[PDB]
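Homework-ish question, so no full write-ups if that breaks the rules, but can someone show me the predicted structure for this set?
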Amino acid sequence: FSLTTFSPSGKLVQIEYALAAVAGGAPSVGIKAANGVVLATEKKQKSILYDERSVHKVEPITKHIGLVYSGMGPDYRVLVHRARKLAQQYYLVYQEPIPTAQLVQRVASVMQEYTQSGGVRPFGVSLLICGWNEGRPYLFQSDPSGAYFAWKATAMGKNYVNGKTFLEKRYNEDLELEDAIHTAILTLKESFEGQMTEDNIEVGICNEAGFRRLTPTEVKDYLAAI
Amino acid sequence: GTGYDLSASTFSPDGRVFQVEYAMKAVENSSTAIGIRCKDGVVFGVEKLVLSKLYEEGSNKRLFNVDRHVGMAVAGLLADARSLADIAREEASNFRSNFGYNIPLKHLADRVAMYVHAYTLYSAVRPFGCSFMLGSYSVNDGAQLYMIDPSGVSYGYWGCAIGKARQAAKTEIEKLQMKEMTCRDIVKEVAKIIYIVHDEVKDKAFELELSWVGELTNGRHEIVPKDIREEAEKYAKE
Amino acid sequence: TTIAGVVYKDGIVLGADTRATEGMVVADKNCSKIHFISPNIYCCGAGTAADTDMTTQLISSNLELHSLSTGRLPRVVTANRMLKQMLFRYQGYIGAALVLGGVDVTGPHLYSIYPHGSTDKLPYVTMGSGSLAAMAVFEDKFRPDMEEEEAKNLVSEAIAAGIFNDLGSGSNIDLCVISKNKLDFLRPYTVPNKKGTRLGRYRCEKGTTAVLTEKITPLE
Amino acid sequence: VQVKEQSILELGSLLAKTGQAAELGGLLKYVRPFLNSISKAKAARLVRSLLDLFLDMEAATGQE
Amino acid sequence: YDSRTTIFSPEGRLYQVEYAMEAIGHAGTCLGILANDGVLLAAERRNIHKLLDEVFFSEKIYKLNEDMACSVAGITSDANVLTNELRLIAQRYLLQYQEPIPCEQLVTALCDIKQAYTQFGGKRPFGVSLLYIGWDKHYGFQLYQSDPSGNYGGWKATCIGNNSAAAVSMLKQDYKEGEMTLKSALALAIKVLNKTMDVSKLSAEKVEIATLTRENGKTVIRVLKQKEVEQLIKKHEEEEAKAEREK
Amino acid sequence: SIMSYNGGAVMAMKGKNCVAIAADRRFGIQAQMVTTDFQKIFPMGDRLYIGLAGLATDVQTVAQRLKFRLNLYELKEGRQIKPYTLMSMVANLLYEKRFGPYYTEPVIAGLDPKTFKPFICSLDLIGCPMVTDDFVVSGTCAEQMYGMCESLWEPNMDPDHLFETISQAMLNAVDRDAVSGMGVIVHIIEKDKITTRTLKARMD
Amino acid sequence: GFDRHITIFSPEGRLYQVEYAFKAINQGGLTSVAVRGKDCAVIVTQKKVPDKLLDSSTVTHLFKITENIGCVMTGMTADSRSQVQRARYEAANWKYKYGYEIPVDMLCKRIADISQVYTQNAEMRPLGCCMILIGIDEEQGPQVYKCDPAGYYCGFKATAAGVKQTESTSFLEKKVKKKFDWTFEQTVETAITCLSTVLSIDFKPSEIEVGVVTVENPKFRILTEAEIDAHLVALAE
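A: Not a homework solution, just the prediction itself:
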């Protein structure tokens, strides 16, 4: 009624429609490398009237937690604001653990107000979470209704099927260094229609030192020689 | 239609709120009204159907006093109109209690319009079926007159009409040359316009409720003395 | 407890003692009375240590969230307003006296926060039980637009005077220097008080301290 | 630490500008430790760029 | 015909609840077998896509208390909140009485909350059914199965998965009380899981099993890691080969 | 006064890759002793213990509530508590009752689950953390433990000598105070073992 | 059904209610143009006044939210006024809670969050009014943003809303693609000629109301009849 609802016999029809909605069209690939995690997405703004440094697709929830998302961006803003508040509350309760990767699983778990209390209309955004304050990296996905999946490499766009196929065929692998961002950009290239540029592609990286949204300078540098 | 004009929270396929589009129809069906900003004040005027002679002298009057210097001339569903008049009185009293002095007409109209918009925004509650003019005068701000639709917003009016015959009244209102005519002749002319609007052609006999505000009354919005404005009614008859 | 701060030419210098006492007995000799808020603003604490710590942690968390939401650097005035609202809501029940200092896009700022919620912007601020000595040192030896090293020396002198002239403060000097582009924490900056060496081997060997019973539970 | 690869690119550009072949070949055979110390893609594209520049001007069909 | 959750049928049935409980059979697969000096749970890992990392260390099996552990078989959205509430109830009892909560009391509390969810208000029934294994001072090792209808049952060998009928039939055929031990329970669980999973020679990754054992005055809930699971698989394979060839 | 209603004296000290926590085992109203086996040292983990001093009812209430929260957190995360995190949790739990504070002064003593780094901290009634690397104590006679420790403590001390020093300090302190004593319990936490000893103390 | 009647996800995977509200913005018969320049940002919208019995003094669609931020509203006037009041309340509350003035981007973000809450749930409905807000921001130059009934807050340089918003956006895209910065004469003239080419009436200097925020001169100047007439004369020269 006022929660996540509309579940007939053996089905979650409303949830299934939410999952059809989050199919979206923004790939937003994520790769969990040995050194860290790379979350790369596509910012294909309509015309040149819009700006790319004004709004962002990758949001640092806390010191080393970065976030990328899928369709229904306005829902994603509220979701990331809630995630920031929840992480801040956890850090205030358990004071000074520098909680990122011992929190990445926890913050993903506390993404239950995200969907288990849907709010009449469930959220229509699936989000990938990265954290590396445990000596090891973490990549998690929360969907409009489920919970943490603990991915190693995935995509959540219009061509997420072929994007995931490209990720597995290109062998996301385990020995890959932090510079698997090249493979992430290549995976975006498959689900991209145009000459991708520094402002057209937004990517954030989360290594053991922390999380950082790569500026257009480094994005263009990586896009060079591709 | 069908499934879209059932609750105000349901938008039309073209992007319209049909509940308010039907609430405006009640105002269009109810009796008309007129309010003219004279040179140094605002003069109201409303005809009221005496549906039966069993009623006493003019009761449930379309004119209301929402504040000391502010008056409301309303048309449409009269019960919700009176409820909204009570809301406006409460708003004026609250503003006087908080900020002192007298509530400016533009701010009062904006606040009551926002309240009406709040009532038409949701689904459980329904849009108000009434449209009214808020008229007031002060030495500092001159004379102002704002008209609020059952769902719209307040708009500054030199002279406005609402109700059964809006266009017919507005034609002669625009024919009348305001902004240089004193409120006395404006009382005479609003009575004249109301009698120009059809009263007994297809309805019963009508009563003329006329209101006053201006420097001739030093603010203090009050009903015009009917005994001395019966001759204005006589001039309107001629 | 003696905390102080000054506005030098390029930013703010904050100084504090590290003596947290329970009544009239020293409990902590290295209590960090300078608390991080944002990478551009710090703040010194005084009074009830637990209330001060909780309040400053809450303000730091809220301001970090605010900076993340805005995408810009936070501002000292915003932190002051948050602190003032929080303290005045409780009408001084939070026995926390704070010295807020930071560097904003509009220039360095230094503020004093009182437990009842009073605030003001001052070139130099002192707070705590031994605040009077540091305030006197500033009044004697303060010069506007004074360079980094001279400001650090002045703050060190004020803190040392508070340490050596108030018994309930000291045992270390904690410093922080901040500017438009530099955030440098110094921790113990000068230790003017050293514990004397214990003459003789005043230690107890094994065999003493007779035990009634002993239980051993080995782990993995 | 990446300035060395910038120097390698800088040296390769002048070798292409002058038209050197033996020096560019020796440089390509020498930079192999640096190729296997950095990102695979960046090292791979540096190898391709140096190879294409070497094959551009000097036509040693028995050596290319 | 279905409507708002709090309804009945012209016959008098709770068809929404029945539909949810039948849907529990769809998807997920867990089974619990109780034996002396040890009671274990076997879970079928549904999705074995190679792109996961298996860092949560447990998906079906959940540790809910020092002396008990559960395994859900419904939608994960309700499963997570139900596990959180169950842990909260157990720890609240521990705080109140300063004693580990008996398994039956914990299961009754959980089924009470589920009965409340299906009883009053316009709220969906909790579409999840979960097993519980645990040890207490009064009854020792216990196993319980609770359905979304809120009507739990005290079982000793049961399955709650997709082919739950086939699994319970295989259990009934090859279940022997008293003589059963922890190792024989492991063998039976692996055998019935191989039966209910069509692909023969099940990998250690697609099967997650946890055993609860009673050490010296202390309950140890050990989840069997990959090497031990595949060693059990190898022993089972040897037994199957000997049995097939000896004919 | 109120903090000295039921007495109590809890000690914690740091050795070389080992910690030691000790406390008196006396419970009773203002002047009399009710029992000589009261528990004030509670194991939050294999290599982490907490000591509480103050009203015995507040001691037990804080211990039970902290155990509840810690068990919930351990179930949620699945990894063992870090002693700094548990000290933070204690600090928050104490501050949640700022205006109704539990009249206890908890201390934390334990080792990191992986790095085996010794950690000892103390908290006031409100919940201010006082993390140091030498020793913390709490109770009615905290000044006596301070005076004893400031001369009996040596940095980088072997676990045997650490036990000797903590035992000497606790015994002398409970001898020189009037409300606590009648038995001292001490726990020595090493990287692989726990040493629980009941000292021979003046039972008066 | 009721997929297209309430704020619920469609079976095809869409949200039809906000899709209808966006067209509700088109309903009402009005257009607005926002142009960011080298140093200033100007917004102009037509002033459709039927009959002169109305007060042209107060029929405006542009307002001052704070001392430096000005909005222009497109869509139903009641929802427009409600959102303007909400924006003013948010700006005042931000100035009270945080000492410095609210950045225009943050104000747009808060309004878009309110609109996203509106499109969430089912008791309420989204407000059919699209707000374009501009303001000078230090270390950022002029800034222009648009908040829509869905909650997607974005837009920059040149952005338009209204019935014929597509043609205005196309012409402004052509202008911005022409690489030349607009000073505080070219930005206003560009906006005026854009709105004139959209609706060819030659724009007698009484039917439009332009709001301007420059860098050297802050504040939302609602330029009077003389200023708009002078700009029109300069442009048509």
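Now go work out the reasoning yourself. Hint: The CA atoms of residues 42 and 209 of chain E lie 4 Å apart.
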